[PDB]
Ligand binder design. Structure first.
Ligand SMILES: NC(N)=NCCCCNC(=O)[C@H](Cc1ccccc1)NC(=O)c1ccc2[nH]c(=O)cc(O)c2c1
Length: 236
């Protein structure tokens, strides 16, 4: 996260850190708890991942330093990538991780609500992006989970900023005209969480953008409300 601040322990209890153990263990991507056995994340995170056996999901983490060889984790039974996914920039950048065991919910770890199809008309004014990613384009994975408040921008406005791309209705954009706050490398797969009527909703999945936090280059996120039928279908 560029231009953010450290999170409070437990304030984003749906946020997980997905690790790979190959060749040695490291953070791979963010993700969100959406059900007892289910993490929602980005499809592009699994480039070159041949097997779910190299994955570990850690929940209830603030600092990466909490994760040691003796720290408990959730195994991944199945990676489910959207069948129309080809690459992040062309959309469908969405994946489900079916966990080997179920998450026991607590103040440190609990699911985020998916948006309702009836909330497409809602104007979210309280949206946050979170993760352990770089704080500049050229950086490293951070110890402490970072957060940044970022305004949504219209698809028409976003499309103006990405003339070489097609910004579809299955994408959603967020950023400041002047830049300065954005997701960056290592934040992908994590949530864009918007608070509305005292309830947090998983509005976006961190997907792509041109560099990080640049002027007139909003972040692009998977528009989660467009995938609620897919999620239901795949989680049955
Ligand atoms: N809003 C904007 N401006 N962009 C959207 C966010 C940036 C997207 N890229 C990303 O977030 C990559 C995508 C990716 C995922 C998995 C594997 C490889 C690449 N992430 C990374 O490049 C990435 C992921 C995990 C990492 N772990 C480490 O220990 C060291 C790293 O340098 C590292 C880098």
């Amino acid at each position: 996260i560029v231009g953010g601040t450290a999170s409070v322990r437990g304030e984003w209890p749906w946020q997980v850190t997905l690790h790979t153990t190959s060749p040695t263990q490291r953070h791979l991507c963010g993700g969100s708890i959406i059900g007892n056995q289910w993490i929602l994340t980005a499809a592009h995170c699994f480039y070159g991942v041949e097997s779910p056996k190299i994955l570990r999901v850690y929940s209830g983490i603030l600092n990466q330093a909490e994760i040691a060889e003796d720290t408990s984790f959730f195994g991944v039974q199945e990676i489910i990538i959207h069948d129309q996914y080809k690459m992040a920039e062309s959309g469908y950048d969405i994946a489900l991780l079916k966990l080997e065991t179920t998450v026991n919910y607590a103040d440190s770890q609990r699911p985020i609500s998916l948006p309702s199809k009836g909330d497409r008309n809602v104007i979210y004014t309280d949206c946050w992006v979170t993760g352990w990613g770089y704080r500049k384009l050229r950086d490293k994975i951070q110890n402490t989970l970072q957060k940044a408040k970022i305004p949504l921008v219209t698809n028409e406005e976003c499309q103006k900023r990405y003339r070489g791309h097609k910004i579809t209705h299955k994408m959603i954009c967020a950023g400041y005209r002047e830049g300065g706050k954005d997701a960056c490398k290592g934040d992908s797969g994590g949530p864009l969480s918007c608070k509305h009527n005292e309830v947090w909703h998983l509005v976006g999945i961190t997907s792509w953008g041109e560099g990080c936090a640049q002027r007139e280059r909003p972040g692009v996120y998977t528009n989660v409300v467009e995938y609620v039928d897919w999620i239901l279908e795949k989680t049955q």
